[PDB]
Amino acid sequence: IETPITANFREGLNVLQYFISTHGARKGLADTALKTANSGYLTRRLVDVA
Amino acid sequence: ERDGLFCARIFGPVKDYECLCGKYKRLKHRGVICEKCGVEVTQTKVRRER
Amino acid sequence: VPLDGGRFATSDLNDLYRRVINRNNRLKRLLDLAAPDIIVRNEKRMLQEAVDALLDNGRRGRAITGSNKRPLKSLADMIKGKQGRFRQNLLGKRVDYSGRSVITVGPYLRLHQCGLPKKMALELFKPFIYGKLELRGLATTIKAAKKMVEREEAVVWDILDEVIREHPVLLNRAPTLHRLGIQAFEPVLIEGKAIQLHPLVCAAYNADFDGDQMAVHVPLTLEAQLEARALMMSTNNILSPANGEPIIVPSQDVVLGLYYMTRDCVNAKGEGMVLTGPKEAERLYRSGLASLHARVKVRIT
Amino acid sequence: MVYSYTEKKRIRKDFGKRPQVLDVPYLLSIQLDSFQKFIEQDPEGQYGLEAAFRSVFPIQSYSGNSELQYVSYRLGEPVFDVQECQIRGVTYSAPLRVKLRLVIYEREAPEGTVKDIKEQEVYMGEIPLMTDNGTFVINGTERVIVSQLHRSPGVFFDSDKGKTHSSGKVLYNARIIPYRGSWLDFEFDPKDNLFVRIDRRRKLPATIILRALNYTTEQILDLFFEKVIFEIRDNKLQMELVPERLRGETASFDIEANGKVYVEKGRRITARHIRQLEKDDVKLIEVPVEYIAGKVVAKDYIDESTGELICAANMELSLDLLAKLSQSGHKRIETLFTNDLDHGPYISETLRVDPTNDRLSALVEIYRMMRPGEPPTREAAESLFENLFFSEDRYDLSAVGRMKFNRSLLREEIEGSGILSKDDIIDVMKKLIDIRNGKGEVDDIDHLGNRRIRSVGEMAENQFRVGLVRVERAVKERLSLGDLDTLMPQDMINAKPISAAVKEFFGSSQLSQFMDQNNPLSEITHKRRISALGPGGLTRERAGFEVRDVHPTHYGRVCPIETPEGPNIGLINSLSVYAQTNEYGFLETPYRKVTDGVVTDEIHYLSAIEEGNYVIAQANSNLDEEGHFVEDLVTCRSKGESSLFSRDQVDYMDVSTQQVVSVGASLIPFLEHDDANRALMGANMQRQAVPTLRADKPLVGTGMERAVAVDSGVTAVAKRGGVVQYVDASRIVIKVNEDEMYPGEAGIDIYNLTKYTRSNQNTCINQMPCVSLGEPVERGDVLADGPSTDLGELALGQNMRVAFMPWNGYNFEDSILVSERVVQEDRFTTIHIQELACVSRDTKLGPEEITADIPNVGEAALSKLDESGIVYIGAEVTGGDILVGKVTPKGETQLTPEEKLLRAIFGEKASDVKDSSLRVPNGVSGTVIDVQVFTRDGVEKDKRALEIEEMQLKQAKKDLSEELQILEAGLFSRIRAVLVAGGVEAEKLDKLPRDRWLELGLTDEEKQNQLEQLAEQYDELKHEFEKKLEAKRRKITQGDDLAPGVLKIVKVYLAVKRRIQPGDKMAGRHGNKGVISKINPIEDMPYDENGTPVDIVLNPLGVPSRMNIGQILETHLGMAAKGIGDKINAMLKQQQEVAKLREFIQRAYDLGADVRQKVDLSTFSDEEVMRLAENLRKGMPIATPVFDGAKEAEIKELLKLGDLPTSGQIRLYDGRTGEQFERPVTVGYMYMLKLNHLVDDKMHARSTGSYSLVTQQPLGGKAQFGGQRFGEMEVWALEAYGAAYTLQEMLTVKSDDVNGRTKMYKNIVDGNHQMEPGMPESFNVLLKEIRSLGINIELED
Amino acid sequence: LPVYQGETTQTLQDYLMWQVELTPFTDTDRAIATSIVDAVDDTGYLTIQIEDIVDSIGDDEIGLEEVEAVL
Amino acid sequence: KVSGRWTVELNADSIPRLKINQQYAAMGNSARNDADGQFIRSNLQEARWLIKSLESRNDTLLRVSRCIVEQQQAFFEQGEEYMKPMVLADIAQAVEMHESTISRVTTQKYLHSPRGIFELKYFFSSHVNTEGGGEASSTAIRALVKKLIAAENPAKPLSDSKLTSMLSEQGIMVARRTVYRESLSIPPSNQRKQLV
């Protein structure tokens, strides 16, 4: 995205700034969730192979 | 029941050593089966094992 | 499995066998009092179809139960799948003595220990507690032990503590990922409703001091105890089996404390002090010296 | 001047910089307006029932000249009252009846009506009314139906391309989503050929429908393709070419432009060349026959002499056939343009692939595709095709859908029929092919201009219309069959199916569930949720990754964060703090239009289509006193990429700085210093809390909790009240002043709040009364103190002091160190109320009845039972104490000499009655709070029940008595005043009523007449009161209904309090999870320099890894506020003067930057000021806005004003060794909430359990002391141990072993320590299953 | 959830079996105790006599005294 | 009677009902054997006859049962005190086709009510009242005896004097001939004297 946010945990954040700052957290949550399972499936396959 | 699902003289004895009719109801009869109803005087395990 | 007391309400293949019993009767009905050549014309086809549906309905057609659009689970259906005989049935059993622990900080209890709430405890040792009560003569009768334990006797508490001394236990976390998930340790009773864990096995447990559970395992056979103290014992998993690095890697604030030990701002009170070291504990704790002090010369042995 | 008669008691310190404009929304209007309209009497039938019935109202005989219609319907009044039904347990609802009209018209007359049965009101079902709290009363139970969020109905040109193509080709598809009927799709295959699809089946030809749709290939091409004249007469090979029409192609050869050749042979097309060719008139210029060979014959031409089929359409022109056509057919033949650079036929390409060329043949292919078999009979295929989309009663998608499709066609009118149309599909194909060649943009899934929220009224209307459709079939069947009848329109009027449908929709539907009762905020939230699962949106828990992203038009729709962390994340949006709803299906957002520098205070809701149009300025923007802007270049948004824009470059302004944060998120203050992910975790935990025994009001919130409880409706608002009449610990009575007192009305209101009501989440809601006595209050005043509320705030949690430092490992990572102090005052003690019941069930072996006659029973058990068998209210209960004791009689015995002797000696039991008794749960103990019972009508046991019935009757009678007494007082006063000035002393009428001497004759002309009228009124009033009492009484004992063959079902509800102990769960409103895990004796927790300790020592090392600056902001704010409260209380300790404390508080509420207007010594009276002081006895309540929080600068300054360290660092003393502590720390007070997942289920053990009938395994999740099942990954781990004994025992001892279980138990008793493997039973079971299927099971040795 | 439940109740017969198994007993003593426990009426009085128990034992060594001790 | 009154429904779902199907006729034609065809035709004949039988059972135990419940209002009106010695011939003549042509169709069939299950044979009754305008109903007299047992003698079940006088107060006058006491599992008077 074009505009970066010049803000700190001791400086706060702007409204649209926070709004942009949300997609990444949402994505990370979704990623951890959808990745635990695939990792498990691969591990299970290997273990069966072993 | 009779001559079908959960029928005596089939799949084994009754809950006690007693035969289906009610005769041979004791520990004295080990393999005796009553004439009124033929049910071996034994345990009910064979209900799953027969 | 009757539902309301009156009606058995059998399901599935037997229910399918019900219709098959019709055919089983119909076969007998075909056997005598019906022309099997003339009958099996439409009868034998439905017979093959229903015999399938009893053995496997998924192959062809659709067999649904009463008021449910779902198909029928036939003889082979409960063999495979996530809800079959090939489900978590080989080693998926529910355990006899374990379950649903609570996790919190074991600040005490140097590494070779493990703290457990006592409520679940001696519900485990119930066989051992009864064995002690009979062996010590505290209950010549099994019912005597049942009453005495049900009475919650403090002598029973002493007996349990005597038993709880020389019997290690096993603990594990929720999602097993490493061989580090489960360790064995000496059980110690604690007055609460949660488990007490030293920072020894923390990261290996892969939990995070938050809403979580643990699993306790009781070695019943002597071989079980010998192996767990030999292999499952946490006091042996020093180095990580995979990377080769230490499994026990001190990563808590103890690092911060040791750091605060070895530092020196510029020159603190008694900067030029030089001594032997044994009473440096006094020179720091009482007065005179700080861990943040520099230029403290000492004869080091 | 904030009067705030409720809140004038306590004024919280705000910190809001911006000047407020618009209040918070009604905050429950979304879950209310839909059902309110769903039965709203509308003069035009526009939606819901007024449409659902009017849809299929007329039921007609099959030319039987018999018709069925309705004049109007009306809904009946309630049977049981809301709380009354709740006690009863039925679904609180209302019947509906419609005046029906069965009209039979005679034959041989044009519509000649012969008889009318338009006199029967038909009650086809009952309407479940939505609550004033908008909560369902389904089967009595507390529940609500989640709203719908789906895709709008219309036509869209979807892309559906990328990696799915598997050919590197961008697909240009399109789908029409109708609100009813078939789903149509026009896809573009890898061969640039269109394909028709219906309901996602095998692809159908693109031109199949057009040929079926009475459209010839000639017409299809003529409309679709632009035909060139190609007037080559006398072999001129001359064409009339427009450089404007077709150009941009290099001229090959024989290129001349009206004589002089403007385009050279082999010359590339130039803008100068095209401009010159356009500037000069271009006539039919000679072109090479090579362009003719490439050209295709557009029109199908026949020879002048013979109608030969030479030169068929969709065929490229051939030079050999060119001579034949030129000599025989004509000289000018239509050709096409098909400019591949800018266009492409792609349909003439599909025209050749067309298998059928006839309309009937095209109809037969449609039937063959739809119906796999049964070929039509020239009527079935045509009927199926006409009914597919050209039918009124099959597709009829939506008038809103019509508007959407018309806008997709940019049609001037948006009002159209839900049925399909030809020109519409033509334009649709035109747009799709144009975009394929490039004319527009595909739609956007994440776009908010595409999603629409359907509300509850429409869903119920849909269910009702569906039910009416099923009924109309039998209605017409009965009207036609035996039409020679004059019966009322009730011959087949069966309400059973309509009621079943309405109930199943309301009752058993995933879109609905029982409501969240955790706290007021959780209830205010869950009822306002928005998820797309269910009848719409996504079909499976899978199938989406971008579906849950942050839409660019979603900035003002949902709060960005508030959604669970489970699998369904991103699919649970919350209605915005001001989320309004559009006219058709969507949601808009109010905003202040910016006009000419000044920003207009007028605000209008704006939609996503509107949203991308104008320019909207950001909230944190200054506005001049003239309304103008401060900085000319201000960050504003025009099309989704916010940037600085001129003061004249803005068109709109927002509403509030919270307009992006909804209620599920708005609560936590100190937002700007709060990180994102941790904030999401914290807020999703925030609704997870339970009201405490002591409601510790939230010190530093976000300013909303007042309203958050006001509109929530867990407290009572003072509906039209002026002063308090009677206050009671069971109810409140308020006398309404005559100004607002209605004429002929009591002028008294009785709000009978119910304590100890077991709400949805098994919590303990007990509304408390606010006033004490004679409190004058205006309308809507906060009167009830609700669960986790305090004088009107979302009082969710305890404000506990804490200090920042790690210590002694007890605070390793995420631990909280609660010393013995908070154990002592036991703040945060948990409350609970849990219920149970039993049934009577008159049986075949003999009815089970509650007689407390338990044979072979211990006496102590009966010590708590009644003759009814019930337990008296207020008893204690531990263990398996008998609760409801029935005795089920068993089969009778014969003479039975042994049993005969047994009955002779002991008798009275004979084992005839078997114990059918209820007992207290194992591991659940408490005190019986309250009871209830309902017996099937006709069963009049009522042993310990007539007492409860009498109590209810007493309460009701007392309630009725008050209004009667008030009216009697009014009448007696009127009578005595009539006797005034008549010589009748008040001592006489005071001594006795005496009818005021029974019209003594004070005037004797009207005094007699007035006395007669008054006596008549009095007698009538007496009769009316008696009648009301009788009606209420008959209602009280109206009889209960026990459908399930139970003579009586009696429920007993007991209570419990729980103590917060080591290990339990807490957190913070600054987003931090943790467990209170260290029980330190009070001699341990460090004490301040003034000696006052803090009971919470927080693990501090976690500060960085989550950017929890908000926790530190909380520490500072809490320290300052606790200081302010302590100072005020200290001033109170010397009993300081009113003026002095007033000045102190006036300076206290005056520090900081400009937020709010409120001044003491001008409005509050001294006692009113004194009252405000007295309530403010533990701090100053703080209101920090989320997007507009207070500066830490004003905080640190007020710390000096509070004579406290602005930095906050302070000395510490170690309670264990008494050393002055290094690192002066900043300590304060922080809020903490106790979340649901308490220990009350955590602990769990088992020693020996039962085996299952099948698979002989242990139970499960604490179900009958159940036990969990081990893990296969754990099994692999166990193998990794190589602990053969361990795995062997786990598969043997901890498994289905029965005979091995007994042997092992015996060995453990004997201390043998041996397990016997044998063979698992499941092994033989699987062998049998093999033998059960078609294969023998035989195992070799 | 599924109505399937297979709780195997002991009805105190398995309790008696565990009691005899946990009680110190020999093969003949355990067999005598099992025979005594086998034919028990619902009320709790033994249906058959001790002499019938000795006859069903079919052992000359099995006597009335041993049957009485077991009972 | 959860609603206080409802049609007994004759357990309509549980009532057996055979279904004829056109495809079933086609399959019978697949059993094209001429002897089997004649057998199937005669079987349809006897099955129609049996349909008459079941309809007879159901309609008789429906109409006669509605007549029996006509004495009752809002489920049980006066408990068991709502009927007299029932004439099965009367109910059959009420069916008016097999008029007093008695049978066993309502017999081997039982109507359930709010109190519980009671047979259609129990819908029939017998004469127990003997004088005092009484000649019918054993249930009413037994219920009077039951109310008397609610206040019977303490030294004995309500003596044949006591029980008979209670019945006479009911006006039935069952007499000691009904005084039932030995039939109510009540022994004699003096044997009922016991230590207090």
What's chain C look like in SS3?
A: CCCCCCCCCCCHHHHHHHHHHHHHHHHHHHHCCCCHHHHHHHHHHHHHHHHHHHHCCCCCCCCCCCCCCCCCCCCCCCCCCCCCCCCCCCCCCECCCCCCCCEEECCCCCCCCEEEECCCCCCCCHHHHHHHHHHCCCCCCHHHHHHHHHCCCHHHHHHHHHHHHCCCEEEECCCCCCCCCEEEECEEEECCCCEEECCCCHHHHCCCCCCCCCEEECCCCHHHHHHHHHHHECCCCCECCCCCCECCCCCCCHHHHHHHHCCCCCCCCCCCCEECCCCHHHHHHCCCCCCCCCCCEECCC
Cross-strand bridge partners of residue D1296:
none
Say if residues D735 and D754 touch (Cβ distance below 8 Å): no
Structure-block tokens of residue D1003: 């005037």
Cross-strand bridge partners of residue D188:
D194
Contact list in D for residue C90 (CB cut-off 8 A) is 1291, 1322
Largest Cα–Cα separation, chain D = 138
Q: Is B6 on the interface with C (CB under 8 A)?
A: no
Who's near D1300: CB < 8 A, 6+ residues apart?
Answer: D1292, D1293, D1315, D1316, D1317, D1318
Pairing of strands D700-701, D1182-1183: parallel
Q: Position of tokens 């998820």?
A: D531
Q: Which residues of E14-37 are buried (b: 16+ CB within 10 A; e: fewer)?
A: eebbbebbbeeeeeeebbbbbbbb
Contact list in C for residue B4 (CB cut-off 8 A) is 21
- Of the candidates D218, D232, D222, D226, the residue with the CA atom closest to the CA atom of residue D246: D226
- In a 13 Å sphere around the CA of C33, the CA atoms on its Cβ side amount to 7
Tell me the C-alpha distance between C51 and C29, whole Å.
17
Contact list in E for residue B28 (CB cut-off 8 A) is 52, 55-56
| DSSP classification of residue D252 | -
Touching, E vs A (3+ Cβ pairs under 8 A): no
Cross-strand bridge partners of residue D156:
D175
Nearest CA in chain E to B18: E39
Contact B49 D1325 (CB under 8 A): no
**What is the phi/psi pair of residue F171, to 5°?**
80, -5
Tell me the C-alpha distance between D869 and D917, whole Å.
9
Measure in Å the smallest separation between the Cα of F109 and chain C Cα atoms. Answer: 18
Positions of E strands within D458-560:
512-514, 529-531
Contact D1309 C134 (CB under 8 A): yes
Residues 1032 through 1091 of chain D touching chain C, CB cutoff 8 Å: 1061-1065, 1073-1075, 1077-1079
Chain C with chain E: Cβ pairs closer than 8 A: 8
Measure in Å the smallest separation between the Cα of C61 and chain F Cα atoms. Answer: 19
Helix H or strand E encompassing D504: helix D495-507
Touching, B vs F (3+ Cβ pairs under 8 A): no
Tell me the C-alpha distance between C142 and D1306, whole Å.
12
Length of chain B: 50
Contact list in A for residue D619 (CB cut-off 8 A) is 15
Tell me the C-alpha distance between D1288 and D1298, whole Å.
16
Distances (CA, A) of D96 to D72, D463, F173: 11, 16, 55
Contact D1254 E45 (CB under 8 A): no
Who's near C147: CB < 8 A, 6+ residues apart?
Answer: C139
Say if residues D1337 and D1319 touch (Cβ distance below 8 Å): no
Helix, strand, or coil (residue D29): coil
- In a 13 Å sphere around the CA of B18, the CA atoms on its Cβ side amount to 11
Nearest CA in chain D to E24: D1310
Tell me the C-alpha distance between C220 and C226, whole Å.
10
Say if residues F167 and F173 touch (Cβ distance below 8 Å): yes
Task: Pick left, alpha or beta for residue D1252 (phi over 0 → left; psi -120 to 50 → alpha; otherwise beta).
Answer: beta
Tell me the C-alpha distance between E7 and E10, whole Å.
10
Structure-block tokens of residue D577: 């703090």
First-residue to last-residue Cα distance in chain D: 96
Measure in Å the smallest separation between the Cα of A39 and chain D Cα atoms. Answer: 13
Structure-block tokens of residue D942: 């009522």
Q: Which residues of C258-269 are buried (b: 16+ CB within 10 A; e: fewer)?
A: eeeeeeeeeebe
Contact C38 F27 (CB under 8 A): no
Tell me the C-alpha distance between D75 and D989, whole Å.
49
Tell me the C-alpha distance between D425 and A15, whole Å.
44
Helix, strand, or coil (residue D923): coil
Say if residues D489 and D122 touch (Cβ distance below 8 Å): yes
Contact list in F for residue C43 (CB cut-off 8 A) is 27
| DSSP classification of residue D1153 | S
Who's near D1188: CB < 8 A, 6+ residues apart?
Answer: D15, D16, D17, D18, D620, D657
C212 labelled binding-site residue = yes
Tell me the C-alpha distance between D1115 and D1119, whole Å.
6
C210 labelled binding-site residue = yes
Say if residues D418 and D180 touch (Cβ distance below 8 Å): yes
Tell me the C-alpha distance between F129 and F133, whole Å.
8
- Of the candidates D559, D446, D207, D251, the residue with the CA atom closest to the CA atom of residue D349: D207
Q: Position of tokens 């299970």?
A: A44
Say if residues C189 and C161 touch (Cβ distance below 8 Å): yes
Tell me the C-alpha distance between D619 and D607, whole Å.
18
Contact list in C for residue F36 (CB cut-off 8 A) is 34-35, 38-39
Say if residues D892 and D846 touch (Cβ distance below 8 Å): no
| Neighbour tally for C153: CB within 10 Å | 15
Structure-block tokens of residue E5: 């439940």
Measure in Å the smallest separation between the Cα of B18 and chain E Cα atoms. Answer: 10
- Our measurement of the distance from residue D11's CA atom to the centroid of its chain's CA atoms, rounded to an integer in Å, reads 33
Contact D899 E43 (CB under 8 A): yes
| DSSP classification of residue E45 | S
Touching, E vs F (3+ Cβ pairs under 8 A): no
Measure in Å the smallest separation between the Cα of C138 and chain D Cα atoms. Answer: 14
Say if residues F118 and F106 touch (Cβ distance below 8 Å): no
Residues 887 through 916 of chain D touching chain C, CB cutoff 8 Å: none
Q: Exposure of C289 by Cβ count < 10 A (0-12 exposed, 13-18 middle, 19+ buried)?
A: buried
Tell me the C-alpha distance between D245 and D339, whole Å.
10
Who's near D1002: CB < 8 A, 6+ residues apart?
Answer: D978, D979, D981, D982, D983, D984
| Neighbour tally for D43: CB within 10 Å | 6
Tell me the C-alpha distance between D152 and D155, whole Å.
9
Distances (CA, A) of D1257 to C174, C197, D994, D1318: 21, 31, 84, 17
Cross-strand bridge partners of residue D865:
D871
Q: Position of tokens 């635990």?
A: A36
Tell me the C-alpha distance between C65 and D628, whole Å.
72
Contact list in C for residue F31 (CB cut-off 8 A) is 34-35, 38-39, 41
Partners of chain C (3+ Cβ pairs below 8 A): B, D, E, F
Q: Is D806 on the interface with A (CB under 8 A)?
A: no
H-helix segments, D673-817:
676-686, 705-710
H-helix segments, chain F:
22-30, 34-70, 88-95, 120-123, 138-149, 160-169
Tell me the C-alpha distance between D835 and D883, whole Å.
11
- Of the candidates D1120, D1122, D1140, the residue with the CA atom closest to the CA atom of residue D1202: D1120
Task: Pick left, alpha or beta for residue D797 (phi over 0 → left; psi -120 to 50 → alpha; otherwise beta).
Answer: left
Tell me the C-alpha distance between C136 and F50, whole Å.
78
- Of the candidates D693, D728, D515, the residue with the CA atom closest to the CA atom of residue D1055: D693
Helix, strand, or coil (residue D840): coil
Structure-block tokens of residue D1043: 């459908």
Measure in Å the smallest separation between the Cα of E39 and chain C Cα atoms. Answer: 24
Resolution of the coordinates in A?
6.6
- Of the candidates D1158, D1160, D1156, the residue with the CA atom closest to the CA atom of residue D1173: D1160
CA dihedral D1165, D1169, D1170, D1171 (to 10 degrees): 100
C158 labelled binding-site residue = no
- Our measurement of the distance from residue D1331's CA atom to the centroid of its chain's CA atoms, rounded to an integer in Å, reads 51
Measure in Å the smallest separation between the Cα of D842 and chain C Cα atoms. Answer: 13
- Of the candidates D587, D1097, D1030, the residue with the CA atom closest to the CA atom of residue D801: D1097
Tell me the C-alpha distance between D745 and C273, whole Å.
94
Measure in Å the smallest separation between the Cα of F3 and chain D Cα atoms. Answer: 6
- Our measurement of the distance from residue D845's CA atom to the centroid of its chain's CA atoms, rounded to an integer in Å, reads 48
- Of the candidates D1152, D1112, D1070, D1111, the residue with the CA atom closest to the CA atom of residue D17: D1152
Cross-strand bridge partners of residue D781:
D718
Nearest CA in chain D to A36: D567
Q: Which residues of D1052-1087 are buried (b: 16+ CB within 10 A; e: fewer)?
A: bbbbbebebbbbbbbbbbbbbbbbbbbbbeeebbbb
Interface test with C, best of B1, B2, B5 (most C CBs within 10 A): B5
Who's near D272: CB < 8 A, 6+ residues apart?
Answer: none
Who's near D827: CB < 8 A, 6+ residues apart?
Answer: D692, D693, D694, D696, D798, D800
Say if residues D1245 and C99 touch (Cβ distance below 8 Å): yes
Chain B with chain C: Cβ pairs closer than 8 A: 5
Q: Is F32 on the interface with C (CB under 8 A)?
A: yes
